[model samples]
Target: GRVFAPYSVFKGKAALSAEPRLPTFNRLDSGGVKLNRRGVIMLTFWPSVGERKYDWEKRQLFALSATEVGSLISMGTRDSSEFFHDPSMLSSNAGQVRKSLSIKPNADGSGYFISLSVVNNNLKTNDRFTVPVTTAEFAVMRTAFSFALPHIMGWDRFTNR
Candidate 1:
């Protein structure tokens, strides 16, 4: 039930005026399960097609999130370069909220696995894009989400039961 006013670590053209005052969100966590120290990297994007003068502002915000935890993934692969051409690759695109694979360490220490899938719901592209992510990236997201596990799991009473 904790909230965090994450400082905008973004430093770019559309960057806000060093606004220390901003909205807050709940810090991720799990119950008593402790995660690795490195923490997880999560990414999301917003579009810039409507109701705005500066489409760059949308880019600015996504940059903040991507750069904040170093969760930005470079889609530059040897086979296909289309991903590299995507503007959303830089951050997020209009009408899209894409999430990287949710990753976490195995409680039993058997190694990590894909806890979640890439969530890309933009109502733009109907085709679901599938890609492989690195173990390191997965570990990061897993640990990051663990911080919010206590709230997300909501099993405080279960421990006693």
Candidate 2:
């Protein structure tokens, strides 16, 4: 896969350095080993409640172009859990790692569907993945996502599922 420099570089007290580097290998309690391959652990949304205006809004979801996907994959590979593991970066309510969503383009050259799913465990471990989108929440996301698609792919033969 092709790797490109990240357009958005996060810089804070705990953010990763500018130079890209792989994380060190460590063993899991259940004897699972580690390798340097890249993977996505989660996508998190910040906490907001009460009168927060944006709290009612859904996070933007955009179709990843071929190049964008490749760039993201390389970025994920470079960023393991190390960036979040650092003491300076860790916090009780700082960030989150939401479950990965399987997003694929619809047929007939339409837009895409962002599927929120739960990844079950294979080794009898309790570790799993899920999205916070409830039935009603998904309805909102569906509306927002569909509304935004036309701006991305145009409104010709494209429509939401």
Candidate 3:
């Protein structure tokens, strides 16, 4: 991957930070947890809903690419959203750690999904790995990331002093 510095940063306030606020859960106990609880609602990309299936594992820190971000919003439609998780032969054959969906290219030719991993345990042993997204939630996520795109791609930036 090419290296690039952030073009600009948004001092997102609590009110300014974008987040989803609906009660879509798989179980009665299935719901979100934690918040920015700060003067200027803190910003975190991790999903607030649900808990992780494992506690000992952690990633070596990461940031999403345009392809990854595009995968998320693209499949989700105005009506029912497409499952972002790919039902791939790879995830099914060699990566059989959980229940796999039918093997095929999703309508948009994507092969994976995204989850902040901050959700509750209302999902399947394997299914919980990915989180559910709402229609309206997608609306705001679209706006939030929409602002982030140009800044990342070099179109949006701060002017020289």
Candidate 4:
């Protein structure tokens, strides 16, 4: 089975409120996903979360490649029976910053998990952060990233850039 569109992952107050707080960019973070011409997934810091001075914090774009995005889509399919999938793997070097996301079926298989982690390797860095998303948040990820498939898979730029 495949997952369809019109996902409401970011409609909740927690996600909607965080969108405005994102650093200025041509593309704003909407509904928990931000796909820019630069091929980055931008996520804003929630009020409940602290700030980090890492490169990822500076650019605010979690970079990925077409292959990684493809893997995410396949793994996120509603009828997927795969045992493991990680959408957070970095396809590009984020300078001194590294980021990753792990998605897994929760125990009892009633729900799934979305875990995000960011680390700064340079001496000039900020405190790292890791957040476990709720089921709703995970759905947002699956849907939003799924929308990025064409952009990620289409054109020579996707492979060359």
Best by lDDT: 4
Tell me how candidate 4 scores on lDDT. 0.41
lDDT of 2 by residue, 1-161 (tens): 54433221111111111112222345677884554333222232222333332231433222232233343334321122111121122565322322343434335323333333222233232222222222343344344334433333323223454
Which tens-of-lDDT digit does each residue in 44-152 have in candidate 3?
Answer: 2222233332222321112344444455445434222222222233643433322221112224433323232222123323222232333444455666665555444
Name every residue pair that clashes in candidate 2.
Answer: 43-98
Q: Distance (Å) between predicted and true CA of 35, model 4?
A: 16
lDDT, candidate 1, 1-161, per-residue tens:
54444322111212111111112344457544432222222232223243332233333111222223233232212212211112365564733555333223345443332222233465543322122334454344435444433433333324755
The candidate with the higher TM-score, 2 or 4, is: 4
Per-candidate Cα lDDT values, in order, are 0.31, 0.30, 0.32, 0.41
lDDT of 4 by residue, 118-156 (tens): 456665554322343555665666577666555444332
Residue ranges of candidate 2 with Cα displaced over 4 Å: 1-129, 154-161
Q: What are the RMSDs of all candidates, in order?
A: 14.6, 18.2, 17.6, 12.0
The TM-score of candidate 3 is 0.32
All candidates in order of TM-score, best leading: 4, 3, 1, 2
In lDDT terms, how accurate is model 2? 0.30
